mmCIF file of N, CA and C in Angstrom:
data_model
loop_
_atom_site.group_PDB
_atom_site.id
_atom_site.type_symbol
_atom_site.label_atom_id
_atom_site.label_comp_id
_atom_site.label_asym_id
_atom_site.label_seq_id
_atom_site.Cartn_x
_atom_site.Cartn_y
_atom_site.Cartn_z
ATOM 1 N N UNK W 1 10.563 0.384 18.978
ATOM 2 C CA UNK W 1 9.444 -0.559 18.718
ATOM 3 C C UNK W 1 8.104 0.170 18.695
ATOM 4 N N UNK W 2 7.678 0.744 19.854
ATOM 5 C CA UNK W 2 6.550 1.294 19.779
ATOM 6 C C UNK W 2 6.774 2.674 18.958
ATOM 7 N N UNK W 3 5.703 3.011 18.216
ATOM 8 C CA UNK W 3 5.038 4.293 17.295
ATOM 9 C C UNK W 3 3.773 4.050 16.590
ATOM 10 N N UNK W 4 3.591 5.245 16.196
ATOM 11 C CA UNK W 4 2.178 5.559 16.013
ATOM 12 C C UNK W 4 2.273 5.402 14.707
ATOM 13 N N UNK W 5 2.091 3.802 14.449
ATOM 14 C CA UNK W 5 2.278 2.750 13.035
ATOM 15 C C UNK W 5 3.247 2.467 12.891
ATOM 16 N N UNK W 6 3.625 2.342 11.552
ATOM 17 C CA UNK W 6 5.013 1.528 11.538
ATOM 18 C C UNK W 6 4.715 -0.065 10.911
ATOM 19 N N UNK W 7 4.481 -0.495 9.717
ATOM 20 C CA UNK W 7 3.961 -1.623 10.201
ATOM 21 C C UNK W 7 5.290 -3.119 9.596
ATOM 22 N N UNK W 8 5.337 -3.940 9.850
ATOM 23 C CA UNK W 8 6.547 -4.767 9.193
ATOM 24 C C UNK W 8 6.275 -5.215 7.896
ATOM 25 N N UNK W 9 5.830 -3.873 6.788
ATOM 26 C CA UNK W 9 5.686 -3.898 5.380
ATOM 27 C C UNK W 9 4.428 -5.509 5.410
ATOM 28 N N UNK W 10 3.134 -5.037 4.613
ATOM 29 C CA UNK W 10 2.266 -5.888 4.293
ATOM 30 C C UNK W 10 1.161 -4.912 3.778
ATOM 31 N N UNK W 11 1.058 -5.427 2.918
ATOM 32 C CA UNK W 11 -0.218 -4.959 1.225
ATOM 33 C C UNK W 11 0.177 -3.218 1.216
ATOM 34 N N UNK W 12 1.182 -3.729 0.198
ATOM 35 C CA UNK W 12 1.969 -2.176 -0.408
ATOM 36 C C UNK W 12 3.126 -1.349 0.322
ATOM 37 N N UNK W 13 3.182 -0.458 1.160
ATOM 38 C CA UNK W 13 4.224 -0.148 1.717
ATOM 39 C C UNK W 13 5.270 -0.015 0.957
ATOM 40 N N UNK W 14 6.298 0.568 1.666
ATOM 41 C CA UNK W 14 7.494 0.078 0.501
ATOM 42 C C UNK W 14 8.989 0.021 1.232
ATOM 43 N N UNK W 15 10.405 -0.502 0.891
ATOM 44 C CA UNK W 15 11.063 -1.005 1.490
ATOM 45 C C UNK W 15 12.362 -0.003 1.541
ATOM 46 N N UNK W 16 13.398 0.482 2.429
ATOM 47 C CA UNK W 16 14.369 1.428 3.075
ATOM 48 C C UNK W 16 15.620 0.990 2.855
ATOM 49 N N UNK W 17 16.594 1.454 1.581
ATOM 50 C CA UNK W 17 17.670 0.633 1.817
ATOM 51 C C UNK W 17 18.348 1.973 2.712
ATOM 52 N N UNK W 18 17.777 2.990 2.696
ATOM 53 C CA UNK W 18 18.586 4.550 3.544
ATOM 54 C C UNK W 18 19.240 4.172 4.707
ATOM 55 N N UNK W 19 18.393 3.509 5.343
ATOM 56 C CA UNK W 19 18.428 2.423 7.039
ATOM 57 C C UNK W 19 17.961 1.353 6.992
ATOM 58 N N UNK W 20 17.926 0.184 5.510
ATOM 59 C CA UNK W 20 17.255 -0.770 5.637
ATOM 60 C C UNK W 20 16.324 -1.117 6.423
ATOM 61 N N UNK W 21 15.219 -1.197 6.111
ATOM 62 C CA UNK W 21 13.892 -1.046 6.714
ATOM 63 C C UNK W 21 12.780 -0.545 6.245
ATOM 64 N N UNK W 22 11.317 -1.586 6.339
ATOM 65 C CA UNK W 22 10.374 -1.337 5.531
ATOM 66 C C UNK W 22 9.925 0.037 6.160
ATOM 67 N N UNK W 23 9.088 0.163 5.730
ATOM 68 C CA UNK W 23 7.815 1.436 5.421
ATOM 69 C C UNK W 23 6.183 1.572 5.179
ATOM 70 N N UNK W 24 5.651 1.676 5.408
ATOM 71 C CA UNK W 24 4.371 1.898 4.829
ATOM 72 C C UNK W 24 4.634 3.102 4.129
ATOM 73 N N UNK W 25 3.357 3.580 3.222
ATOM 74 C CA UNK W 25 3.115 4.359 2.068
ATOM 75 C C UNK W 25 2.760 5.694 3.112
ATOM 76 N N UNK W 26 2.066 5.227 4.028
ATOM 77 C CA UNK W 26 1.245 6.350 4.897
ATOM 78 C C UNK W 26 1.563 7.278 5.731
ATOM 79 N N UNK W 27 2.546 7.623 5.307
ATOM 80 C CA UNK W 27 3.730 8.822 5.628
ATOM 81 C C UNK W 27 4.974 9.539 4.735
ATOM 82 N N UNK W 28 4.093 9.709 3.407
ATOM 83 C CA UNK W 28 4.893 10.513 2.566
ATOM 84 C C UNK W 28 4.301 11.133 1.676
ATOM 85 N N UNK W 29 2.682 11.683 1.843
ATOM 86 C CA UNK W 29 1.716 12.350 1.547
ATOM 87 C C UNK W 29 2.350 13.465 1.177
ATOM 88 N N UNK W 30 3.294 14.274 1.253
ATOM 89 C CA UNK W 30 3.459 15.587 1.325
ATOM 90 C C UNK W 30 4.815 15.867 1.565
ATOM 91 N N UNK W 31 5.757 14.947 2.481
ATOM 92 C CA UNK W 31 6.854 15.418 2.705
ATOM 93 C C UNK W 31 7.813 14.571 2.229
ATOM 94 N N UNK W 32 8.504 14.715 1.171
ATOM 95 C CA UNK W 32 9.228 13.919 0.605
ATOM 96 C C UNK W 32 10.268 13.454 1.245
ATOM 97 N N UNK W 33 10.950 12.621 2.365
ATOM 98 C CA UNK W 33 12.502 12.351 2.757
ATOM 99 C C UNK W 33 12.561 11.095 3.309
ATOM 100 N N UNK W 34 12.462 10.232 2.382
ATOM 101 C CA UNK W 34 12.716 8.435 3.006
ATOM 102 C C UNK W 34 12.897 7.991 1.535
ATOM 103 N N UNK W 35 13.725 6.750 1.823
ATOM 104 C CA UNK W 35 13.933 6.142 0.654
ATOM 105 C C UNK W 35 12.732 5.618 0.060
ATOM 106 N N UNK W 36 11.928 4.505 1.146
ATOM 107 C CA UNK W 36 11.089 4.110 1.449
ATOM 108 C C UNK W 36 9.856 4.512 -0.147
ATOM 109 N N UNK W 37 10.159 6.073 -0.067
ATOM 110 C CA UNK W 37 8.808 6.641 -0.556
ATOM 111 C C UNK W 37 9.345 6.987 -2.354
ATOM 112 N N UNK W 38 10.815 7.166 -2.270
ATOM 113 C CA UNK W 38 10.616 6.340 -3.811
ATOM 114 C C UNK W 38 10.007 5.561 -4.878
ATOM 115 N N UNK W 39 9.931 4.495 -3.336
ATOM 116 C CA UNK W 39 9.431 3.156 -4.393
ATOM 117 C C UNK W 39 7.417 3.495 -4.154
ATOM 118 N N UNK W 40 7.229 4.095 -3.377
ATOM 119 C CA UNK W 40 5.764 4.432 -3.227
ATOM 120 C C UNK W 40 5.374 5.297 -4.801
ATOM 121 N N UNK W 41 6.139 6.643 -4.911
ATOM 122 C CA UNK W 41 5.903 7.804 -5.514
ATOM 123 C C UNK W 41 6.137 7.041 -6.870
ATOM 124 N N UNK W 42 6.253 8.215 -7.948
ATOM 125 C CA UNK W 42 6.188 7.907 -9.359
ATOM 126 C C UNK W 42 5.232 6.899 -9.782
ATOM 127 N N UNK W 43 4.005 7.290 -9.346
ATOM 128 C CA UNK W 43 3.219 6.203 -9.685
ATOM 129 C C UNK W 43 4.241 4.684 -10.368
ATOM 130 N N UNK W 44 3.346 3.572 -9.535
ATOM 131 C CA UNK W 44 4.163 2.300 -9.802
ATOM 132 C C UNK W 44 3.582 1.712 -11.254
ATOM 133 N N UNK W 45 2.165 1.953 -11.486
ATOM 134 C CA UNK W 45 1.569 1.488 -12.483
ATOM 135 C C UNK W 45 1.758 2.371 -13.651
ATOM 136 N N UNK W 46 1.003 2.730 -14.693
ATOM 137 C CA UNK W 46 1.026 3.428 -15.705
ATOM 138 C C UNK W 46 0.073 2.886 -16.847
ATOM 139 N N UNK W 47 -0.633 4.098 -17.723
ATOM 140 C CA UNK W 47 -1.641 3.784 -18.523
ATOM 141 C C UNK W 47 -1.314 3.072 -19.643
ATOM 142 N N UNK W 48 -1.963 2.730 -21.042
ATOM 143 C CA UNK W 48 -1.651 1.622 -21.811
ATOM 144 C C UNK W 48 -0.686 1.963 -22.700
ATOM 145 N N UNK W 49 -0.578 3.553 -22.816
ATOM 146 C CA UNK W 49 0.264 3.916 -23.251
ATOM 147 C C UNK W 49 0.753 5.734 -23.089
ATOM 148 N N UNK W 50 -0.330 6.385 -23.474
ATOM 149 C CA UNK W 50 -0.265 7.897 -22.341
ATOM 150 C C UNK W 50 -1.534 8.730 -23.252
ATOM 151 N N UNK W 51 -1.376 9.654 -21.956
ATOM 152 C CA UNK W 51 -2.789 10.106 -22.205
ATOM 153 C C UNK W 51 -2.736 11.434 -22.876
ATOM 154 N N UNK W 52 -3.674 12.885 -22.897
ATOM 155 C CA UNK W 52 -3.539 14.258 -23.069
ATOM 156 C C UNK W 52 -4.042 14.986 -21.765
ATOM 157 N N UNK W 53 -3.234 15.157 -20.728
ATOM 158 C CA UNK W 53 -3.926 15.850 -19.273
ATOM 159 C C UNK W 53 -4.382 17.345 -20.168
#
């Protein structure tokens, strides 16, 4: 129960079928290993159609 966050998924986050169980976004900055951060990564949105980086 207790940790340093954790929250029961609310505005974004994303959801764990690895161990079923939500997630927040705010722990996969850098280290890729939760299901969780799938659904965070690959940007969710996308432009109108694509750009020239």
């Amino acid at each position: 129960e207790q940790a340093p966050g954790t929250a029961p998924c609310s505005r974004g986050s994303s959801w764990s079928a690895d161990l079923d169980k939500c997630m927040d976004c705010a722990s996969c900055r850098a280290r890729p290993h939760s299901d969780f951060c799938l659904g965070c990564a690959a940007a969710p949105p996308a432009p109108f159609r694509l750009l020239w980086p």
